[PDB]
Design a protein around this nucleic acid. Structure first.
Lengths: 206, 127, 150, 109, 96, 98
RNA sequence: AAAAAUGUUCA
RNA sequence: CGAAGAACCUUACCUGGUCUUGACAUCCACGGAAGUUUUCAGAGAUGAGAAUGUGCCUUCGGGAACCGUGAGACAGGUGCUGCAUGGCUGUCGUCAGCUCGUGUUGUGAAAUGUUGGGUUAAGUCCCGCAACGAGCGCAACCCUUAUCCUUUGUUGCCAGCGGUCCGGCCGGGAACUCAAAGGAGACUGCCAGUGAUAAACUGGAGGAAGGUGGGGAUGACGUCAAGUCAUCAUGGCCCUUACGACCAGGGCUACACACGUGCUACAAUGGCGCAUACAAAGAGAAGCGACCUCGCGAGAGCAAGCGGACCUCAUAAAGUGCGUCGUAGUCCGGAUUGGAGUCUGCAACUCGACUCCAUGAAGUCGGAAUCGCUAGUAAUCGUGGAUCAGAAUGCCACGGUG
């Protein structure tokens, strides 16, 4: 198809960037790379957690790190006992000063990476696909939504006669670029090949 | 100076200070045919001036910059009668309907990826 | 189509006061450019002026509005039978077409310069050396003698 | 009904303000009395079988009692009263009007 | 990928400015276009070692030369990937 | 005198949260300069959107990187305390002169 | 209301 | 076209040198600070050496980094399946379509809606109707450009003011153009007529701009087992002293043909010689490199300036006025080749670019046939950028004329 990156649209209206910090052509490359390294380890060790956004401010080229969680469990009952360890990795990779700031999403499971990673994990334990997605679609509407639309891949069982699981639900426009829509990507993995996971949730307006 | 005019037409914008004095066109210490070579251009911008007859009775300085050759003269033509809608507001109608405070919007359009020009695309054959 | 489509109006030649003269520079347009075109216009104009102290403008006008095009063949439905309909040309478009042709005719007369062409060429008014006489013998030959209808 | 009053049902362009005005004025043209209800009446006198024939089918599938009169070319059916008559006359139609108004809230008085 | 093809590429850059570049660049007048003196000349053609003219800039996540951008230090797709997701400040679609 | 170069991406940033240093500087210094523009040093790219062939589709990029620089000029050299140590801002090139 | 065929096997 | 640059190197291909828990990963044990400068032979990979350094902490054992060796579990594979696939992209198609829920009709498949009468650029809006409601799409909502207002004035500006090395060269003024943040505006909104009094349409005005204003960006539910395992990701399959790995040379720039996509001319509406006119937008500290000196020249030296509305790249070209040549394959055109040079690189023989001179072609505007383009479009004339050590008649972008 001919497609357009969905949250790639609403940059500057209400959607931020993840590398916002001024810089020059020499270090543009370098600092970009530098962030993403540390992100890889992060998400995997914070897959005991449902994570929600990550952004960098470089306030003095001494980083910031404003990782988001949706569980507050990261910082309660391992209050810094945890977080230190993460900051430690930060220091290890980034040879400039290393500091960490943790934010919270009170939304538990709905919108952005939260329905992303959630629905992936289910496929990867081979929870009933048909019924699985259906429960995750009533859920997000319980907690309220103006409509959510997941789309996953077909070719179940490795073969194809047409049985691709689709989902639209609710109302999910994309004409108005000021009625603001969430989107994340994530991918499941199966022992017959990768399945796409793409979540398009309609909460928002400016 | 006692009447000013903008007029920005074909990417050239031209200052106009219409001064008290006498018919003459002084533009960058010269004339038209002196700030440029042979011109068709010179006649065209005198067209509003004979339209009801002026420039025998006031003096003007013009400082056009950038854009075209015709584009410069575009700017001259535009700003003089954006300073002669304010010298006369009776010919307000007779300048907008005579298309001299009308901005030309036929401006050069940009190139695209996969196209040679603004609309041009490759030829195909096989013989 | 469903709209009559034209475009912006060109300006009349400003140092002889004549739209026809300006539309004939356009005909001669060389490099995409009116400039190097206007030279030769004016060069051959003078040639004509010398031989013709009176207007040398009525040797364009007569020649080309003697020639009155009328022929093509189309078809339309009428009463439930289509018929092969011959169609007349409207008197305005006759004009519009005709002015061009004579000046189109240059750059093939195998001269050195467009002086010697357009000069000797244009001067004639009904005894043309231009395409105007050469289309006469086809337009009226055809029409109403091998054309079954208006 | 109460939105009507407010200036935010007639805000911005005419391609909104009078679009909302039209879409409501022609949505209580004849359906103004049907929004006063929330449910289903006990009775439903129709005059037709030429444009209320959907009533004489569907609401006798719900079993809601239809009383009725002829169109003079069809006999209404599904029904449980029907009358010989016409759908036009002032000794027919206009005459029956006044048994609506004086027998219905006048049934237990 | 091709881990192996990459591995190579890396080490060229160490020697590039540690046993070449100011070791080699030591030519001065008498060995360039200013002047000539065959002594010095032929004994600084004698080492070749590593060279940055035998080094491509490379993508640091592919190491192909095709469709390279200095500007981000990465290839075609390894720009576009990031950029679509809205990670990078102020890059936007053309729309003027 | 002093050159103050504010060079940042967004207009929501070169114009917003940048007034906090114009403020504090009035008292310590003796003048302010308002936010003077500059011809904006900008980019635009093209990256081939396909992973293989199809040059009919390439993603065409733009990127204004705005320049209103402000550029407070001070013969007063007592400005510096409340100017620079006190106040802070990131996402914006902060540059000072004599 | 302006002539005109032909399509190896297999989802 | 993938490939915005194939000398070697890259680069997968080839020929050769060379190796097999490995070139690349983790973990365990052994030895040893890491390293430093150097010798010989080899094409190099390397192999075999000579001296030199004795770091970081210690709880003195121990570690921390790292180097060599040992050993496997393992590792490696741009290898094969794009009909095992994700992701991406193209495609019809920027087409106005596409449905759904509820009710109803029909035994059902399905239908309705979504059809009809008008209308819209549009399943656009109105009227009507066993259809009633809702969702995706279309345009809308995002951008940008056409005026004018607001502010802010340095590296930018020069009205009006004086000075002037006469040069915005100086102060000076922020008016102005410009800059660039925030606005004003357009809404068939008004005016007439037309139209089912309906929706709506056509003219009119005013304006910078009317009736989807002009230019972007947006590809529906989907189809093409479309392309892409070699961008990347990956299911299975396969190779395992190797389909693995490391190095040197050669190839990817043959050629006996055929075709695609380009560039350049054939000329006076031009060519050449002179002088001369006006642009816009980008580039940039191993960076751009003025200047001034030499070099006919390419360019080399010498060296300032700028972190670039400062300085450098930087010098627009058609155009213009004059000089000429006369329609000749020439004064057109420029291939081919000879000889001499510049530069990037260790180094340019295959297969790097530029200049000087000499040699001076084919081609005399192109058949049958065939293609694009509706306006600042076609046309034409330059210009800059990327890529890039170093390779544009290529790609990308910008304005002039038209």
């Amino acid at each position: 198809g001919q497609k357009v990156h969905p949250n790639g649209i609403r940059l500057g209206i209400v959607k931020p960037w993840n590398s916002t910090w001024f810089a020059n052509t020499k270090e543009f490359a370098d600092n970009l790379d530098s962030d993403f390294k540390v992100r890889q380890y992060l998400t995997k060790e914070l897959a005991k957690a449902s994570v929600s956004r990550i952004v960098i401010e470089r306030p003095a080229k001494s980083i910031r790190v404003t990782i988001h969680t949706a569980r507050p469990g990261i910082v309660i009952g391992k209050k810094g006992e945890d977080v230190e360890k993460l900051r430690k990795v930060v220091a290890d990779i980034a040879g400039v000063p290393a500091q960490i700031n943790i934010a919270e999403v009170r939304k538990p499971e709905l919108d952005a990476k939260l329905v992303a990673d959630s629905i992936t994990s289910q496929l990867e334990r081979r929870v009933m696909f048909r019924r699985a997605m259906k429960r995750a679609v009533q859920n997000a509407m319980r907690l309220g939504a103006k409509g959510i639309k997941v789309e996953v891949s077909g070719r179940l069982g490795g073969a194809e006669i047409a049985r691709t699981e689709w989902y639209r639900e609710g109302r999910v426009p994309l004409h108005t670029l000021r009625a603001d829509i969430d989107y994340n990507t994530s991918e499941a993995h199966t022992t017959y090949g990768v399945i796409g996971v793409k979540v398009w949730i309609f909460k928002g307006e400016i | 100076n006692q009447y000013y005019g903008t007029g920005r037409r074909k990417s050239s914008a031209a200052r106009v200070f219409i001064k008290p004095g006498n018919g003459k066109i002084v533009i960058n210490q010269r004339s038209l045919e002196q700030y440029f070579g042979r011109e068709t251009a010179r006649m065209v911008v005198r067209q509003p001036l004979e339209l009801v007859d002026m420039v025998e009775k006031l003096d003007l300085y013009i400082t056009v910059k950038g854009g075209g050759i015709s584009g410069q003269a575009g700017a001259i033509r535009h700003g003089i009668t954006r300073a002669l809608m304010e010298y006369d507001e009776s010919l307000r109608s007779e300048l907008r309907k005579a298309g001299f405070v009308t901005r030309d919007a036929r401006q050069v359009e940009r190139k695209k990826v996969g196209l040679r020009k603004a609309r041009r695309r490759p030829q195909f054959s096989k013989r | 189509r469903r709209r009559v489509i034209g475009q912006r109006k060109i300006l009349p030649d400003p140092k002889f006061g004549s739209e026809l003269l300006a539309k004939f520079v356009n005909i001669l347009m060389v490099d995409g450019k009116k400039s190097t075109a206007e030279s030769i216009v004016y060069s051959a104009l003078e040639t004509l002026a010398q031989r013709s102290g009176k207007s040398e403008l009525e040797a364009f006008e007569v020649a080309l509005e003697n020639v009155r095009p009328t022929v093509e063949v189309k078809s339309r439905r009428v009463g439930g039978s289509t018929y092969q309909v011959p169609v007349e040309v409207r008197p305005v478009r006759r004009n519009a077409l005709a002015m061009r042709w004579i000046v189109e005719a240059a750059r093939k007369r195998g001269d050195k310069s467009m002086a010697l062409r357009l000069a000797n060429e244009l001067s004639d008014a009904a005894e043309n050396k231009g395409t105007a006489v050469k289309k006469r013998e086809d337009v009226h030959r055809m029409a109403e003698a091998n054309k079954a209808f208006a | 009904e109460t939105q009507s009053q407010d200036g935010t049902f007639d805000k911005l362009t005419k391609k909104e303000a009078l679009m909302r005005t039209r879409e409501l004025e022609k949505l209580e043209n004849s359906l103004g009395g049907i929004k006063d209800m929330g449910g289903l009446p006990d009775a439903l006198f129709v005059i037709d079988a030429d444009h209320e024939h959907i009533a004489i089918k569907e609401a006798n599938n719900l079993g809601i009692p239809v009383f009725a009169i002829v169109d003079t070319n069809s006999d209404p059916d599904g029904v449980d009263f029907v009358i010989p008559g016409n759908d036009d006359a002032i000794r027919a139609v206009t005459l029956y009007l006044g048994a609506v108004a004086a027998t219905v809230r006048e049934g237990r008085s | 990928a091709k881990q192996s093809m990459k591995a190579r590429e890396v080490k060229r850059v160490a020697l590039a400015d540690k046993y070449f570049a100011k070791r080699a660049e030591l030519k001065a007048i008498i060995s360039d276009v200013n002047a000539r003196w065959n002594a010095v000349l032929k004994l600084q053609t004698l080492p070749r070692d590593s060279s940055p003219s035998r080094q491509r800039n490379r993508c640091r996540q592919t190491g192909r030369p095709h469709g390279f951008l200095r500007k981000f230090g990465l290839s075609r797709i390894k720009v576009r990937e990031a950029a679509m997701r809205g990670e990078i400040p102020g890059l936007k679609k053309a729309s003027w | 005198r002093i050159r103050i170069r504010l060079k940042a991406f967004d207009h929501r940033l070169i114009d917003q949260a940048t007034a906090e240093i114009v403020e504090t500087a009035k008292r310590t210094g003796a003048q302010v300069r308002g936010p003077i523009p500059l011809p904006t040093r900008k980019e635009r790219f093209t990256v081939l959107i396909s992973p293989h062939v199809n040059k009919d589709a390439r993603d065409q990029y733009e990127i204004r990187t705005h320049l209103r620089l402000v550029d407070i000029v001070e013969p007063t050299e007592k400005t510096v305390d409340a100017l620079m140590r006190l106040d802070l801002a990131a996402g914006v090139d902060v540059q000072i002169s004599l």
